[PDB]
Amino acid sequence: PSGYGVLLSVHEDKTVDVFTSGRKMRLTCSPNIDTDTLALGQTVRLNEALTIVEAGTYEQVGEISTLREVLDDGLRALVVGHADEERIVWLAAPLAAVTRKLRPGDSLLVDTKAGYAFERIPKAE
Amino acid sequence: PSGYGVLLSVHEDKTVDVFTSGRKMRLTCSPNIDTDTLALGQTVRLNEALTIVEAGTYEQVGEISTLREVLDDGLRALVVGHADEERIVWLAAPLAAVFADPEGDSLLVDTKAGYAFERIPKAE
Amino acid sequence: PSGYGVLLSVHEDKTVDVFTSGRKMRLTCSPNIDTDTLALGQTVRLNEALTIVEAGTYEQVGEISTLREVLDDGLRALVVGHADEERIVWLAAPLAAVFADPEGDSLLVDTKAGYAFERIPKAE
Amino acid sequence: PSGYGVLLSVHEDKTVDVFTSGRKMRLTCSPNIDTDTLALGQTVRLNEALTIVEAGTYEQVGEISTLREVLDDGLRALVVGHADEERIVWLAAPLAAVTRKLRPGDSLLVDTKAGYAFERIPKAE
Amino acid sequence: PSGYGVLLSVHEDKTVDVFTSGRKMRLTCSPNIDTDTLALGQTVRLNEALTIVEAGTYEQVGEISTLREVLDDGLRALVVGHADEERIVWLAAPLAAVFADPEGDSLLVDTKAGYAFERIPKAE
Amino acid sequence: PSGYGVLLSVHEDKTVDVFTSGRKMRLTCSPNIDTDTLALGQTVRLNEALTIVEAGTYEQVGEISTLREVLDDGLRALVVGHADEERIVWLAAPLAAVFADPEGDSLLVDTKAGYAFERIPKAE
Known part of the structure; x- marks a missing residue:
């Protein structure tokens, strides 16, 4: 199964802050994700390891x-x-x-x- | 024992978004589920592994x-x-x-x- | 220890929906239980495996x-x-x-x- | 550590219903506890196995x-x-x-x- | 890492009741705690094992x-x-x-x- | 992954109280962190072991x-x-x-x- 969160910020090192399971976390993205095109506030999909594997919409x-x-x-x-x-x-x-x-x-x-x-x-x- | 959730969306790969245990999750369906026949908003039944095993009513x-x-x-x-x-x-x-429905x-x-x-x- | 739940509905396959530990579940009854005598809304007792083992009061x-x-x-x-x-x-x-009110x-x-x-x- | 709950009822078989960790459960008591003298509504102490090991007051x-x-x-x-x-x-x-x-x-x-x-x-x- | 709770009572066997993680628990104290000097209501610091390791302020x-x-x-x-x-x-x-304190x-x-x-x- | 918390206080022993995952904890800072430069109320980042690894904005x-x-x-x-x-x-x-209000x-x-x-x- 995957979970979801709300994207809060994108860091210089390509990690991201996400609000998920009721708290803020700093997470990494799959290499296939272009972090330069993420939109703050969009819903993102997380695998069981809490890697961002997909960007969704608001x-x-x-x-x-x-x-x-x-x-x-x-x-x-x-x-x-x-x-x-x-x-x-x-x-x-x-x-x-x-x-x-x-x-x-x-x-x-x-x-x-x-x-x-x-x-x-x-x-x- | 089974749990339940509310179906939110169906994806192209036959997985589904479901609201269950207080949050949205992307889950898979059993072989019996024809996702083409699902209705958004319906209650879905989940086994221990969180596979959708039955599509129910609202x-x-x-x-x-x-x-x-x-x-x-x-x-x-x-x-x-x-x-x-x-x-x-x-x-x-x-x-x-x-959609009448009023107001x-x-x-x-x-x-x-x-x-x-x-x-x-x-x-x- | 045993848990408890509120009996929500009885299905045609003899399973039962129960609200227990803060969520809706579909559970199986012990063979001892006559599901045709179950009464909607009554409290049911569960073993650790979540089988319904006794039906009780409201x-x-x-x-x-x-x-x-x-x-x-x-x-x-x-x-x-x-x-x-x-x-x-x-x-x-x-x-x-x-019953009878409002009106x-x-x-x-x-x-x-x-x-x-x-x-x-x-x-x- | 021990937890606590509120005693709800005493059964013929000497088990008890207790409200603990936000739900009703049917629990057993230590053999040293005289269930005949329990008072409904009193706080009871539970060991890690959820056995009632002590009766308290309200x-x-x-x-x-x-x-x-x-x-x-x-x-x-x-x-x-x-x-x-x-x-x-x-x-x-x-x-x-x-x-x-x-x-x-x-x-x-x-x-x-x-x-x-x-x-x-x-x-x- | 340590957690915290509110001291509620001291028992004769040097264990204490503490309100922590949203409920009352009976916990033990470290060798450094002189339970004779504890003040009811004070915050207590708990290690991973939930032993009281320090008695603090309100x-x-x-x-x-x-x-x-x-x-x-x-x-x-x-x-x-x-x-x-x-x-x-x-x-x-x-x-x-x-106790003045008013009202x-x-x-x-x-x-x-x-x-x-x-x-x-x-x-x- | 890293978690986060709100810095509540800095202790004389260099540990810090932090509100994180819905509760107050006493945590240790990475040697990298100059605890004398920490600012009350700022967000701190935690590793999986709950060590403070970075201090951030409010x-x-x-x-x-x-x-x-x-x-x-x-x-x-x-x-x-x-x-x-x-x-x-x-x-x-x-x-x-x-500041300045009520009055x-x-x-x-x-x-x-x-x-x-x-x-x-x-x-x-």
Whole structure:
């Protein structure tokens, strides 16, 4: 069987930080994986030895939180969840650009354990 | 003895993603499983080795959430729970079959697996 | 030592779904057990190999929830918990025998196993 | 090392049901233990093999809940906790008698995982 | 590598009850521990074998609860948390030393271990 | 693989308390690590034997809580979470350098490790 985790960072030595089984770990990738093309926040597949053997895409289901503000660094956002839970999360690539821009009350799909926002979910009317 | 999980996806090599023991796993299927006939969201039965040995029905008990909108893709929906927790979930076939659905419909959901399975009269 | 679980369903092949050690399992009964006399929601005792070796009484302590409606199938009910969490649960065999509210009855429930066991006014 | 659990019932065959490590189990007692004198709801000590090797007393710290009503059987009570959480619990012996009697709004020390009430905690003024 | 727990009691045979890894355990002490000098509620350091190897100070971070009353025994107190969860906890020495305390004082507590350790100005 | 933890304290014997895999541990540093340069609250990397092999940056994502007061010791603060949960946390090294509210500042916290790391207005 394989498990999965959320990619957090790629190091100069081609190891990666991944959030998996509820904790951050530094893991190695299979030689066939091009680490230069990994996208932070994407789900990655792990073998039993915890080597990254495949890159997937971003989570498509889960918690929604409301955007309050993108932080000064342009990399993280302050979001507000259901019971008034304020949190900081990383912006995945499709959100960090900038064409469109993120505006406060935008609804964002988030993983608050890994600390990532993946997708904006549109429309009241 | 067998365990269970919620089927999430089927891969080209006949392995499947399943949500079981609180996380997503990629698992193999027994010779009896024709993956072509699997329905996403259904419960699957797992042997000790975590091989899928039987494909079952959708969950029938659990949390209730309220439908806010089906997303543009027609695959997912925005649902709101008891303390106004908004989530995105996948729609199982029975919900996609009617997609009416409104908006306010009460849906049986598994928020860990990320699925909505059944509409519950409020009602009737 | 023996473990325990809540009997969820009895299958046509005589195996049984049981909620035990925090998850749903499909288990086999000792030949001693007459599976046709098993009662939904009752506590079953397991040996170390997870064979069902004895069938017992129903859970008698735990969470109280309020009945909202008995579903159209007569097997499940919509209940509302203390913080307005709505859930669907199975009716244990004693409750599967009649009810009547909204249109309010207080039920002993185990939301992890997904069962209601007993009504709390003066009821047996 | 030893672990602990809450005694739930004593069987005719001298085995006992105990709530330990978050679940109910049927366990045996050391031959030196007189099972006839066990008190339901008391904490019991388990060796690594999960044999009951010692009986203790009732929990003395933990959750408080307010009594609503003793059930018709005289063995269980409906209690109401902080966030309006209603639950049924077993009455330990010092509470089941009957001299004094339990009255609704009494504060009770409870273990809502094992499903027991142990002690009444007195006095506003 | 060492773990930690909260000391709950000392036994006549020099073993101790400690709350560690989310539950109470009876553990032994190293030759260096003079159990006569232990203070109930203090943090203890445990080696891989779960032997107490060092007795430390009280916890300094964690949940805050409000004092309602010290119980008649002078050993325990009724405390109320954020969602008005009332609990009974043991008093550590520093709190017993002042027992003033009032009632309204804010106390640093570990509700799993069942201890109050320190009074926090509201204040100052 | 390597694990990670939050550095809680540095002891006079050069060992360090670290919150890792959901609990507090006392660990040893690789000889490479200058323990006098370690900074409270920083993330440390662990080998499989749980030796600290590298010291890193601070947590940058997670829960936001509101500062109520910096305690008299200048090392800890009282913070209030989203559901009015009050807690005492340690100040990470960057925050241990000044503050100022009630008499309101938003702090990034990890309540499991018991640390605040960063203030969120425009602050570095």
